[PDB]
């Protein structure tokens, strides 16, 4: 990917930070894909997460190409969801949504899935040809038993707001999270090691 034009189709500071720290050079072009798919339409939550990442990356790829007639080399999409007792949780709409999510998660183990779509693009015959490679990573996370007081403490901080399931493992989310099991970068927002393995598959 060194001398290729790479587009990260995500406004997430946490995803950007992970890719930058890994040494990747990329431009940030957030997706306008605002349709959210029917969760019931997918056999698995990770199927849902991948398709969502694919659609965001394809939206960006086509939009860029339509704009200046330049096929971006690679467009990366990602979508992180939480599942607990069979329900998919995404980002909280407001603080009250956040509290409900965290109550649900309290004292339980849940899964975090990040679906990733790597889209290779080229232009031929006045159209964008896209080749999509799709993968996901699952990490299990355990919450300790949260009190009404801690719950509202964390909600009022605002930390829940930009995060799947309304929490993070990194800061004052540390008071909520008892343990993580698998790839921790996947929980932050991007499964870096899996991505790197995917690039090896695609280029070798």
Numbering used by the authors: 10 to 213
From the paper:
Maf (for multicopy associated filamentation) proteins represent a large family of conserved proteins implicated in cell division arrest but whose biochemical activity remains unknown. Here, we show that the prokaryotic and eukaryotic Maf proteins exhibit nucleotide pyrophosphatase activity against 5-methyl-UTP, pseudo-UTP, 5-methyl-CTP, and 7-methyl-GTP, which represent the most abundant modified bases in all organisms, as well as against canonical nucleotides dTTP, UTP, and CTP. The protomer structures of the four Maf proteins revealed a large β sheet containing seven β strands (β1 to β7) with two α-helical subdomains on one side and one long α helix on another side. Thus, pyrophosphatase activity of Maf proteins toward canonical and modified nucleotides might provide the molecular mechanism for a dual role of these proteins in cell division arrest and house cleaning.
In many eukaryotic Maf proteins, including the human ASMTL, the N-terminal YhdE-like Maf domain is covalently fused to another domain encoding a predicted methyltransferase protein, whereas in some archaeal genomes (e.g., Staphylothermus marinus), the Maf gene is associated with a methyltransferase gene, suggesting a functional relationship between these proteins. Whereas both YceF-like proteins were inactive against these substrates (30–90 nmol/min per milligram of protein), the four YhdE-like Maf proteins (E. coli YhdE, BSU28050, YOR111W, and ASMTL-Maf) showed significant metal-dependent pyrophosphatase activity against pyrimidine nucleoside triphosphates dTTP, UTP, and CTP. In the ASMTL-Maf structure, two protomers form a dimer via the formation of a common large β sheet through the interaction between their β6 strands. This oligomeric state is consistent with the results of our gel-filtration analysis, which showed that ASMTL-Maf exists as a dimer in solution (observed molecular mass, 44.5 kDa; predicted monomer molecular mass, 28.3 kDa), whereas YhdE exists as a mixture of dimers and tetramers (observed molecular mass, 47.2 and 101 kDa, respectively; predicted monomer molecular mass, 24 kDa) and YceF as a mixture of monomers and dimers (observed molecular mass, 24.8 and 50 kDa, respectively; predicted molecular mass, 24.5 kDa). In ASMTL-Maf, the phosphate molecule is located close to the side chains of the conserved Ser19 (2.4 Å), Arg24 (2.6 Å), Lys65 (2.6 Å), and Lys100 (4.0 Å), and it probably mimics the position of the substrate γ-phosphate. In Maf proteins and structurally similar ITP pyrophosphatases, the side chain of the predicted catalytic Asp (ASMTL-Maf Asp88; YOR111W Asp103) interacts with the conserved Lys (ASMTL-Maf Lys65, 2.9 Å; YOR111W Lys74), possibly stabilizing the unprotonated state of Asp.
